Amino acid sequence: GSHMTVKYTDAQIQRLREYGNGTYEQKVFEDLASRDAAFSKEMSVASTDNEKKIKGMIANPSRHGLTQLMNDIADALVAEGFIEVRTPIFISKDALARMTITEDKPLFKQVFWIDEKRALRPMLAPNLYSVMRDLRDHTDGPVKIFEMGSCFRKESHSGMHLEEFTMLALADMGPRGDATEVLKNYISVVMKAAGLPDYDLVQEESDVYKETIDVEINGQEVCSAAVGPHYLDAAHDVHEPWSGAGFGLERLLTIREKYSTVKKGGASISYLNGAKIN
Amino acid sequence: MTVKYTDAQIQRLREYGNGTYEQKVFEDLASRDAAFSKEMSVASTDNEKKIKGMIANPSRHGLTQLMNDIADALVAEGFIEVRTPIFISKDALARMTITEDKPLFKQVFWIDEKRALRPMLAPNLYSVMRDLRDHTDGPVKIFEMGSCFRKESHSGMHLEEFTMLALADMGPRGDATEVLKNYISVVMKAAGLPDYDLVQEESDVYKETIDVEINGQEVCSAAVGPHYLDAAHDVHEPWSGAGFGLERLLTIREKYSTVKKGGASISYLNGAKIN
Ligand SMILES: Nc1ncnc2c1ncn2[C@@H]1O[C@H](COP(=O)(O)OP(=O)(O)NP(=O)(O)O)[C@@H](O)[C@H]1O
Ligand SMILES: Nc1ncnc2c1ncn2[C@@H]1O[C@H](COP(=O)(O)OP(=O)(O)NP(=O)(O)O)[C@@H](O)[C@H]1O
Ligand SMILES: O=C(O)C(Cc1cccc(C(F)(F)F)c1)C(=O)O
Ligand SMILES: O=C(O)C(Cc1cccc(C(F)(F)F)c1)C(=O)O
Ligand SMILES: [Mg+2]
Ligand SMILES: [Mg+2]
Ligand SMILES: [Mg+2]
Ligand SMILES: [Mg+2]
Ligand SMILES: [Mg+2]
């Protein structure tokens, strides 16, 4: 709210980001009159750019941006020997408690319950671990699998959070080499296939995996990876070694396409491929 | 020879097996049960081979691949692929005439007092196609593939979560029914199922649909406007739309014995049982 180095107001920024995918919060003006004259021209550009974009998209449709991204990453993983799997969106109360997501946990508040014993999955690891364990019964080789699909969380409506988002989870179980070097190679395969070859690996605290490697771009988390802990497999004393990585595909797409909010590239009845339709 | 496998035997055979067990006939119970024993063994042995073969040649998932084949075929017809939220409002369901009095209301999974898991794609596609009509004079051609949810009975071609492909063309160039029949043909050929029948059927939502059936099995329900549900969605022009059950299509094309094997699962992967 500085009246000396005058920026666009907070309201003006939301109005600009509604239709525009430029960058707006850095502009500085001499006075209010110059801020507001610039806002007028910026807002007009943003809205006309949006209308051109949606008209060209209607006239020349492609696969959806999120589906295309999923396909690029999936074909890359399959070429590295990963099996694509699809698991149910419902998961049982039992599976959630087996991840130590229990009545006392921070993530437990965020769970959507469907009935007394089942919920919408907030993560992919529970189902993926089960499928991976069963596939290990049929082979002496390592098992590498991945899934892409919707997970659901109750969220604080902050910067890069959706209640429904599309996660990619990849996992590798069985005989290991240098586990972390293999995992880092997988992340690189995914990140290059996504079109985001430049990123940082930062270690972040976690209540579920204890310690994770995060993937960050300009300080924004797009992925957590881990060498697998063994609390999910409570029914066996002896566990298989495994590791995995979970990527936020809407976050990847948003960063790559430089959309101004995370609501624009995924599932929506207000946005289609970055453009506002109403 | 009039003795057949019992229903319990059929379900046991189909658990691991993808043959056509319901055709077999036997002289007496002894021969039925001796055949059952052999068929169960073959089914389990064949299944183990299949799952090892998948591990040896990893691939895209069979459902995802079918989705991509149909979706690329529809893009090639000028359709816009959209993705819409799995959550829809109680009001959106009411505008489809899915209201508290109606029996259909009880198949809906509720999230909160005013939000539900979508049991169908038309509520969101209605909303998007109407908005896109604000930007063009031409046909608005869109489609979505995504999970839908219904409380059901036994798994007779029925899942609780299934994948629907719904397409819609609002304000088509040509008779809306003729255009629909052409787009259904595009989908079915792209799915590898060029032989099918169009059959007019009743619906508690649409009152009348054109269904796609293969050997009497419903794989699609379609509808043509102007339609009585159009007013509540601010639609005032001809349109045609169709919703396909992608797991049903995949099951029929691959000859899987149940609809549980080709879709999302923690027990099945591409037609084979993993546990
Ligand atoms: N609500 C959400 N909306 C969009 N993407 C999400 C959401 N939650 C998680 N993701 C993405 O999915 C990945 C899964 O990691 P996970 O550790 O479960 O989330 P997280 O640690 O809570 N990330 P954050 O909530 O931003 O701090 C993350 O790296 C994100 O890229
Ligand atoms: N529970 C389900 N499991 C799998 N596919 C389904 C299910 N319900 C509907 N579908 C598929 O989705 C398509 C469009 O939905 P809709 O026409 O509303 O289903 P429906 O008329 O209730 N089918 P049915 O239950 O066999 O009488 C159907 O033609 C089926 O192919
Ligand atoms: O719980 C979570 O923090 C997420 C992210 C995650 C971290 C490690 C390994 C995986 C895996 F195996 F599914 F791919 C996933 C989730 O489980 O989806
Ligand atoms: O999804 C539904 O509502 C229907 C399928 C359907 C019939 C007509 C038009 C559409 C449309 F508009 F989405 F494309 C979809 C159902 O069978 O459930
Ligand atoms: Mg979080
Ligand atoms: Mg994280
Ligand atoms: Mg039904
Ligand atoms: Mg029917
Ligand atoms: Mg029907």
Residue numbers in the entry:
A (entry chain B): -2 to 275
B (entry chain A): 1 to 275
What text does the study give?
Here we report that pyrrolysyl-tRNA synthetase (PylRS) and certain PylRS variants accept α-hydroxy, α-thio and N-formyl-l-α-amino acids, as well as α-carboxy acid monomers that are precursors to polyketide natural products. Here we report that the tolerance of MmPylRS for substrates with multiple alternative substituents in place of the α-amine extends to Methanomethylophilus alvus PylRS (MaPylRS)38,39 as well as MaPylRS variants (N166A V168L, MaFRS1 and N166A V168K, MaFRS2) that recognize diverse l-phenylalanine derivatives. We expressed and purified an MaPylRS variant containing these mutations (MaFRSA with N166A and V168A) and demonstrated using RNAse A and intact tRNA analysis that it shows high activity for derivatives of malonic acid 14 carrying m-CH3 (17), m-CF3 (18) and m-Br substituents and low activity for l-Phe. In vivo studies using traditional and engineered E. coli strains confirmed that MaFRSA supports the biosynthesis of model proteins containing internal, aromatic, α-hydroxy acid monomers. This work describes the first aaRSs that accept α-thio acids and α-carboxy acids that could support carbon–carbon bond formation within the ribosome.
To better understand how 2-BMA substrates are accommodated by the MaFRSA active site, we solved the crystal structure of MaFRSA bound to both m-CF3-2-BMA and the non-hydrolysable ATP analogue adenosine 5′-(β,γ-imido)triphosphate (AMP-PNP). The structure was refined at 1.8 Å resolution with clear substrate density for m-CF3-2-BMA visible in the electron density map. MaFRSA crystallized with two protein chains in the asymmetric unit and an overall architecture resembling previously published PylRS structures. The two protein chains in the asymmetric unit are not identical and interact with different orientations of m-CF3-2-BMA. In chain A, the pro-S carboxylate accepts a hydrogen bond from the backbone amides of Leu121 and Ala122 and the phenolic -OH of Tyr206. A hydrogen bond from the Arg150 guanidinium positions the pro-R carboxylate for nucleophilic attack with a distance of 2.7 Å between the carboxy oxygen and the α-phosphorus of AMP-PNP. In chain B, the orientation of m-CF3-2-BMA is flipped relative to the conformation bound to chain A. The pro-R carboxylate accepts a hydrogen bond from the backbone amides of Leu121 and Ala122 and the phenolic -OH of Tyr206, as seen for the pro-S carboxylate in chain A. However, in chain B, the pro-S carboxylate is rotated away from AMP-PNP and towards Tyr206, resulting in loss of the hydrogen bond to Arg150 and a longer distance of 3.9 Å between the carboxy oxygen and the α-phosphorus of AMP-PNP. The two alternative poses of m-CF3-2-BMA in chains A and B correspond to a rotation of ~120° about the Cα–Cβ bond of the substrate that largely maintains interactions with the m-CF3-2-BMA side chain but alters the placement of the reacting carboxylate.
